[PDB]
């Protein structure tokens, strides 16, 4: 089916073996300090221990969103110096900003995550290229008036894809991501679950990130700690529509979630 | 989608709405008696309205199976008739002897529930029709050399079908289960799994038992309490697939997976 890897620097990922799994990790900063001290990263090291000991295959690691420029290098830069030298995986950074991507990369990084899909700062994509790295383009905009949901998404990726290519971003450094939770309802969400699929005419491998979000929340009425079977529906249904990689927070529960998956779909 | 409701002497079950969970009542026998004993079967109520409470709509209680004639009345008897004063739900009973299932209907029991698919002893079906029961066909054989894994699951449901009509059952009385864990290997369960929407062409509701069961262990690697994600991961490929109902162990995990399943699917 993919008749390329991932290339990730020293790390090689598989897109037809399994599902796989990225972590998120997520940054508690210190709130005494504005950069890299002893709390802050020996808890992100810890945390992106237990998720390589959980079956993540990838740490997500993100400085500002939920800001400065200077301050999201800062924070994020000795993080993953310091998660790179002590967990074996590839990092990707979380930003929208080509500075902060470049300055990510060059302390370890991987893969980048642009949730403004190249839009945001369009510079980001020539880091991307300068590098070599691979970048996953999400679904986003500032507004939400849609004449179709679907058709329009399918659209705007395209358009992220356009900056990659004509920064010299290669086919096989890009991904995408339907950005479920941004710029959309909770029912435009659902949809967009319910059509993922349409995502695969693009030929790109997709992520999902739909772990605990907000319209889970609105499905089951219950509030963001109490979304484990929520967020496994969507990841179910995603690695049934095509889906290479889900972004999920409970990394245990979600890898046994895949790989039954992975094993009934016949991946 | 259905056009009629499933018909269960006071109670109505609407198959369009959601995808209903039928909750798996486990018996422990008393070891000191043969009968009703106030551990048992105030134990077994316990249990019911912890399920009831959990989002179950269908207590599933079934006294043999993992035997004598008299043995299962006596025993499955008092449940039933507790359980039905105490919790205000369908009942299915588990059993595949005639006898058994007549009596079970008598104490309060609604569904009968046929791990045999009126192979076991044809005149479950009578029964069945008899009282009006919806009735519960599971694929199953005491063999498993099979030409064509689908074709046969098919052409075998299709056999109880027609015991079951040949004794007045109504086609709105009856209900299909693929029966993963009975006579498969664990390859043929996964391959069922990924197939499952194929009962469909057969036009009748489909029920589906995946809980807990041994091909999940053997894809996970992971002991019967361990098996919630691989289970979990069970009941959304097969909502998706199709599915009216699920019955499983775990009632509070699998009722919100599935609430989640229906929102995204646009049941
Ligand atoms: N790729 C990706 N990145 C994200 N960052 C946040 S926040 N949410 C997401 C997401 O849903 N997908
Ligand atoms: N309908 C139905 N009944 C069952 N009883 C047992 S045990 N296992 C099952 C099952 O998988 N389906």
Redesign the interface.
């Known amino acids: 089916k993919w008749d390329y890897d991932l290339r990730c620097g020293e790390y090689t990922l598989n897109l037809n073996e399994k599902t796989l799994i990225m972590g998120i990790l997520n940054v508690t900063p210190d709130s005494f300090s504005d950069g890299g001290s002893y709390n802050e990263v020996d808890a992100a090291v810890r945390h992106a221990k237990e998720m390589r000991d959980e079956g993540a295959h990838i740490i997500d690691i993100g400085g500002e969103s939920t800001v400065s420029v200077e301050e999201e290098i800062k924070r994020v830069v000795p993080m993953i110096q310091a998660v790179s030298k002590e967990v074996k995986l590839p990092i990707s950074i979380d930003t929208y900003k080509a500075e902060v991507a470049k300055q990510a990369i060059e302390a370890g990084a991987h893969i980048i995550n642009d949730i403004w899909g190249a839009k945001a700062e369009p510079k980001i994509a020539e880091v991307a290229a300068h590098y070599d790295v691979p970048i996953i383009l999400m679904h986003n905009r500032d507004n939400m008036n849609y004449r179709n949901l679907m058709a329009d998404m399918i659209a705007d990726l395209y358009d992220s894809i356009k900056i990659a290519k004509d920064a010299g971003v290669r086919d096989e450094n890009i991904i995408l991501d339907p950005g479920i939770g941004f710029a959309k309802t909770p029912e435009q969400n659902?949809e967009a679950?319910?059509n993922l699929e349409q995502l695969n005419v693009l030929g790109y491998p997709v992520l999902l990130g739909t772990s605990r979000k907000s319209f889970?929340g609105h499905?089951?009425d219950?509030p963001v700690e109490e979304r484990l079977?929520?967020t496994?529906?969507?990841v179910?249904?995603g690695i049934?529509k095509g889906c290479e990689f889900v972004r999920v927070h409970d990394v245990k529960?979600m890898s046994?979630?895949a790989?039954?998956?992975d094993?009934?779909?016949?991946k």
């Open positions: 659902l679950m319910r889970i499905v089951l219950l079977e929520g496994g529906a969507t179910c249904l049934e529960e046994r979630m790989k039954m998956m094993a009934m779909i016949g």
